[PDB]
């Protein structure tokens, strides 16, 4: 039986087939592992093989170098480190060769590279790997498939290996990563992979963001990537904008007004959930930040010293624009339930709530007008919106400021509790369930 054949039977629809292929490949790993890893790795490398087999092979390598279970993961990484060095050099090569020689899109090689780098970079046993990959991205004569395969591998390593293990090689990786995102880069498949690796590289790139020169460049490449017509990129591009807002709030005052604001706001409005959800996520992070900041401030006040860092009250500022966009998104509610299911609505709720606890004061006045106008609306959607909007701001604003509004609204509220709509009925239950638990 050629290995190719067994690899293939791991997808066979026949339940027996599946079985055999599985036990045969399971014994192999536990009884001829060095050989097994070499053959497999040889399969993965030959463009003459089927997407099916090439991929099955790759998986078998990954599943022998990593697990989701921490205890097994180490065991495997130990088992590998203790294999003959040459055999591991032989495998390390076929894998690394495969880069750029794959037809199918999700690179079966990338997983392998990370699965080994994860066990060898920490004991300096594969020092060629990083500079190598960095080159595949930076050599101009490099094929697109090369740059994509590689950028994906960089991403997995950036993702599965401790960030401290790459702090000394940040610069190189960042260059290669940003290279794949430049406007000039043709293939969006590459631009995607590159942007996806950048997301995991933020943790160990602090050095770079602190240098006004470089950071200024990164925000450009990221911002321009949010324009890429390939949605898939536009999403990952915003994903970085969000994670950055979190890690580098202090450096943002330069980009916030002249670009970030417009981008994220349009983002919260695209009909494409995947996108909207990211725009929302953005501000929800600004809030977490500006609240922790207000706390740090309240603590330095009781020390007679200015606070280390300072809020710029972006949330409080965008409040006039955020609220109407959020309340309206509370309209686009999915009729057949998406119960826990994270859609633009559920998120726009959580956000409004975060705003209310972040601007205990300024919030109520921007939301109220919407509530009053649509509380008695014929459309169950806009109605439910008003009901939710109200129950959202119930936490944060001074109790004294809320009590009058509660009481003067309690009538129509309790009535909504038995509204014809089954959705308004649950919402009205929640809002009322809050007006209690929050203030008897």
């Amino acid at each position: 039986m050629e290995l190719i054949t067994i690899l293939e039977k791991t997808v066979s629809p026949d339940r027996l087939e599946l079985e055999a292929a599985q036990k045969f490949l399971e014994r192999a790993a536990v009884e001829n592992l060095p050989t097994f890893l070499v053959e497999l790795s040889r399969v993965l490398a030959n463009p003459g093989n089927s997407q099916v087999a090439r991929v099955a092979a790759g998986l078998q390598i990954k599943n022998s170098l990593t697990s989701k279970d921490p205890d097994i993961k180490a065991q495997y990484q130990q088992r590998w480190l203790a294999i003959d060095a040459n055999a591991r050099r032989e495998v390390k090569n076929y894998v690394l060769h495969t880069l750029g020689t794959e037809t199918y899109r999700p690179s079966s090689a990338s997983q392998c590279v990370a699965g080994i780098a994860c066990a060898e970079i920490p004991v300096n046993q594969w020092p060629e790997l990083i500079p190598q990959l960095v080159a595949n991205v930076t050599n101009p004569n490099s094929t697109e498939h090369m740059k994509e395969s590689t950028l994906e591998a960089i991403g997995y390593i950036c993702q599965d290996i401790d960030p401290e293990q790459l702090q000394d090689k940040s610069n190189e990786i960042l260059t290669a990563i940003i290279q794949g995102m430049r406007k000039e880069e043709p293939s969006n498949n590459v631009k995607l992979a590159a942007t996806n690796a950048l997301l995991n590289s933020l943790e160990f790139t602090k050095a770079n963001f602190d240098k006004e020169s470089e950071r200024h460049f990164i925000m450009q490449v990221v911002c321009e990537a949010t324009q890429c017509p390939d949605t898939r990129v536009r999403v990952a591009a915003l994903q970085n904008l969000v994670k950055i807002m979190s890690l580098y709030y202090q450096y943002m005052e330069t980009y916030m007004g002249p670009a970030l604001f417009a981008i994220t706001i349009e983002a919260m409005k695209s009909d494409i959930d995947e996108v909207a959800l990211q725009g929302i996520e953005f501000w929800s992070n600004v809030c977490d930040e500006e609240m922790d900041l207000a706390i740090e401030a309240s603590e330095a006040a009781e020390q007679g010293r200015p606070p280390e860092h300072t809020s710029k009250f972006y949330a409080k500022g965008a409040l006039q624009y955020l609220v109407p966009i959020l309340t309206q998104t509370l309209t686009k509610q999915d009729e057949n339930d998406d119960d826990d299911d994270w859609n633009p609505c559920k998120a726009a709720g959580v956000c409004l709530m975060l705003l209310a606890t972040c601007c205990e004061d300024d919030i109520v006045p921007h939301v109220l007008p919407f509530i009053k106008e649509h509380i008695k609306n014929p459309d169950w959607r806009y109605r439910d919106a008003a009901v939710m909007a109200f129950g959202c701001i119930l936490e944060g604003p001074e109790p004294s400021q809320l009590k009058p509004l509660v009481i003067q609204a309690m009538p129509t509220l309790i009535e909504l509790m038995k509204d014809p709509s089954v959705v308004v009925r649950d919402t009205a239950a929640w809002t009322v369930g809050r007006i209690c638990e929050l203030l008897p």
């Binding site: 101009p140 260059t175 290279q179 430049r182 770079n208 020169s213």
Partner: peptide, 22 residues
Amino acid sequence: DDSKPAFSFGXXXXXXXXAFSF
């Protein structure tokens, strides 16, 4: 082809603004 250079992160140089761009 006279293809693009490559920005290097490493050795660089850190009454109105000259802000930011696209």
